[PDB]
From Swiss-Prot, chain C:
Residues of the full protein shown: 1 to 52 of 258
Family: Belongs to the PspA/Vipp/IM30 family.
Species: Nostoc punctiforme (strain ATCC 29133 / PCC 73102)
Signal peptide (from-to): none
Compartments, as annotated in UniProt: Cell inner membrane
Protein name (record): Membrane-associated protein Vipp1
Binding partners and assembly: Polymerizes to form rings, filaments and ribbons. Rings are formed by stacked rungs that tilt to give a dome-shaped curvature. Rings form with symmetries ranging from C11 (55 subunits) to C17 (119 subunits).
Job of this protein: A membrane remodeling protein capable of forming rings and/or filaments on membranes, which then curve and tubulate the bilayer. Rings will form on liposomes, altering their positive curvature so the lipid bilayer is remodeled into a negative curve as the membrane enters the ring. Ring stacks of varying lengths can be seen joining isolated liposomes. A lipid monolayer can be drawn into the center of the rings. Required for thylakoid formation.
Superkingdom, natural source: Bacteria
Entry note about domains: A helical hairpin is formed by residues 25-137 which is conserved in all known ESCRT-III proteins. Helix 5N-5C (residues 193-217) contacts the helical hairpin 3 subunits away and is essential for oligomerization. The C-terminal flexible linker and alpha-helix 6 (residues 220-256) are not required for oligomerization and do not resolve in electron microscopy.
């Protein structure tokens, strides 16, 4: 049981880390769309100056 | 399950689902962009 | 300066003046407007994705 306790703690930490990684990947997946929006802003502004 | 990609079939299914949801969202945004008290 | 540079400048200066004689204001104004509008249309779609 002494070792079973430490094993349980390790599994808990691993589960926490996995959830954190999932959250960060989701954040990156949003940042991708934000960057596409920035690309469109750049091209629109370049269109305006050409006028 | 939605959030894991162990199976290729689910991978493809979810990918198409997201593609279609994005297409509908595009249509809705284009609707907004260009443009019940009374009956209660 | 160079020689090939000079020859190509002459050839270019001839072709350009050949083209600039074909341009007709009444039609090229409309063509410019048409492409203007095409570009605006293609920008709308980027804005739409941002909103989504």
């Amino acid at each position: 049981k002494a070792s079973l306790d430490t094993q349980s703690t390790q599994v808990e930490t691993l589960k926490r880390n996995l959830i954190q990684l999932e959250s960060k990947i989701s954040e990156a997946k949003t940042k991708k769309e934000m960057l596409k929006a920035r690309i469109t802003t750049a091209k629109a502004q370049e269109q305006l100056q050409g006028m | 399950v939605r959030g894991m990609n162990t199976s290729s079939a689910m991978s493809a299914f979810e990918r198409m689902e997201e593609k279609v949801l994005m297409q509908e969202s595009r249509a809705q945004a284009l609707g907004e962009l260009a443009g019940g008290s009374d009956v209660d | 300066m160079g020689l090939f540079d000079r020859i190509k400048r002459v050839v270019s200066s001839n072709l350009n003046d050949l083209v600039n004689k074909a341009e007709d204001p009444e039609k090229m104004l409309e063509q410019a407007i048409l492409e203007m509008q095409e570009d605006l249309v293609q920008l709308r779609q980027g804005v739409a994705q941002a909103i989504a």
